[PDB]
């Protein structure tokens, strides 16, 4: 029993981290057999942020100018190339921890773990979830450029976030480990705003999915819903379309609790219009949206209470 | 910028897991050193002198990953069973066995046979429970902090009450609150709101740009301390107004000014209003949480 915001295991991505220092600028990179992956704005002042020409500032580098610190160990840079809006470095040492990795861009409402690393360290690990915005409520500051956001499926670390920079609003952006950011963002100081931001509303279903394997079905009504239906209550409320494609996801935890997915949607609308009247689900007040359907089977029981 | 409920990084600890099997019971054990240390329970109202009397080396069956570890010996300290085996851990970090106080937070690495499936933050209630996050297998999951390069054993989950908290021991064998190990009709006391954690928070939300429940007003601790009792808040001592001294100099806000922000939230709620992305007062995050989060310290 319990319902907790769980992040992976981080021991395969600590083992990963190291410094990148270019120049006076110290960022965190990401040390994969004989690569280092770290943003490309390593190579960047404070002044070229304003409009850099990173093919013109990279030009102008050599293998000596990167200094990369694996622990209390100087890594020799020997190579060096852009990939999109990363840096990827050469290193003449391949790291002997190097877990079995995979690349992966993410969908908005998608979760993964934060590793957030200073100076090639790692302080601390929470869960979070790429928002339908494209950005993420993280906890980030100065220095936590580079840190990655990974996925342990079975032994597997699969790395889908690489922290790049911190909008006005106090939100974060990123890319994939290409260097494709994740929304309309580029690595330049530049009148860049987030979108307004919708709740994810597959995540929310999910949760009171689990809220019903845990015990709670205070929320649940006798009413059901059409799909276009609950859409079009959903979006005065500012929660992201349902589409056919996440009820079928939710497939498994309706069959699980005997509630059907249009069913747990009338719920869903009951609790948009009412809100909670002192309850709460699952220890919250908040109708919550960073536990995906694959989250809440992995973490919840598979006998219900 | 950002708040987040956050853990320490785990791998020092996921380098220390095992799984411990005794005849049909299996759950997780720690691994330092020559020795593994597991909850007592895994050999069964139980004599549990005269069940591991009853025991040889050879019964206990010790998995470190594929590897399977040779029990040499065995003893009993309090609820934790130390079980000797014959290889060293390679991977033992820098480490510590600490005893935590009711509000103090600490990292959980959930497992399940030996294998680490999740980590995530929680705190010592004042009622000596957890609100955990675990099912049944989870039993030997360890609770810790890290201190620069040391890690500090804290908790050792031995079982779920029937409320779904959790209960179990410092490393020692010694439960946190008035539980026993073993089938019988227990409760968790009455639980109180960890005031010092809540007033950490405040002056995070400060920090990061909330201020819409801060006032103009003042109060005595005696005065706020009446309030504090009569929503199941635990007392503010003079100790807990010490402590976030550091958090009132760097925002410019009292603790009794602080205290009378609490106060009104208490009274009145939050009208529709939240902070820190949350509806309730959170009481999870203690004052050198806040200041750790809001600087960057590395491990
Ligand atoms: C101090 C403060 C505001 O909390 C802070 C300050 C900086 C933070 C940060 N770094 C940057 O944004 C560097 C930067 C600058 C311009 C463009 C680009 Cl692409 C990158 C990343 N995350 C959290 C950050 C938090
Ligand atoms: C099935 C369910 C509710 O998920 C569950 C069931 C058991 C869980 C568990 N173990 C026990 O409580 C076993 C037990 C019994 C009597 C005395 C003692 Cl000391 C221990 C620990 N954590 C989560 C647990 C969760
Ligand atoms: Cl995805």
């Known amino acids: 029993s319990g319902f907790r915001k769980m992040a992976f295991p981080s021991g395969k991505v600590e083992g990963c981290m190291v410094q990148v220092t270019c120049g006076t600028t110290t960022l965190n990179g990401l040390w994969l057999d004989d690569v280092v992956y770290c943003p490309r704005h390593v190579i960047c002042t404070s002044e070229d942020m304003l409009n850099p020409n990173y093919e013109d500032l990279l030009i102008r580098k050599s293998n000596h100018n990167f200094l990369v610190q694996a622990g209390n160990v100087q890594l020799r840079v020997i190579g060096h190339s852009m990939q999109n809006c990363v840096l990827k470095l050469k290193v003449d040492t391949a790291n002997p921890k190097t877990p079995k990795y995979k690349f992966v861009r993410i969908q908005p409402g998608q979760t993964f773990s934060v590793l957030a690393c200073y100076n090639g360290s790692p302080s601390g690990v929470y869960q979070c979830a790429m928002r339908?915005?494209?950005?993420?409520?993280?906890?980030?500051?100065?220095?936590?450029?580079?840190?990655?956001?990974?996925?342990?499926?079975?032994?597997?670390?699969?790395?889908?976030?690489?922290?790049?920079?911190?909008?006005?609003?106090?939100?974060?952006?990123?890319?994939?480990?290409?260097?494709?950011?994740?929304?309309?963002?580029?690595?330049?100081?530049?009148?860049?705003?987030?979108?307004?931001?919708?709740?994810?509303?597959?995540?929310?279903?999910?949760?009171?999915?689990?809220?019903?394997?845990?015990?709670?079905?205070?929320?649940?009504?006798?009413?059901?819903?059409?799909?276009?239906?609950?859409?079009?209550?959903?979006?005065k409320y500012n929660y992201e379309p349902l589409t056919q494609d996440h009820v079928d996801i939710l497939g498994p935890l309706s069959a699980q609790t005997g509630i059907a997915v249009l069913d747990m949607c009338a719920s869903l609308k009951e609790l948009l219009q009412n809100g909670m009247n002192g309850r709460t689900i699952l220890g919250s007040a908040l109708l919550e949206d960073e536990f995906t359907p694959f989250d809440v089977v992995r973490q919840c029981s598979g006998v219900t209470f």
């Open 132 to 235: 339908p915005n494209f950005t993420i409520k993280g906890s980030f500051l100065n220095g936590s450029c580079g840190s990655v956001g990974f996925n342990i499926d079975y032994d597997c670390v699969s790395f889908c976030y690489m922290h790049h920079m911190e909008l006005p609003t106090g939100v974060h952006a990123g890319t994939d480990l290409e260097g494709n950011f994740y929304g309309p963002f580029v690595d330049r100081q530049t009148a860049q705003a987030a979108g307004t931001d919708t709740t994810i509303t597959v995540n929310v279903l999910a949760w009171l999915y689990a809220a019903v394997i845990n015990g709670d079905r205070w929320f649940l009504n006798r009413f059901t819903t059409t799909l276009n239906d609950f859409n079009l209550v959903a979006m």
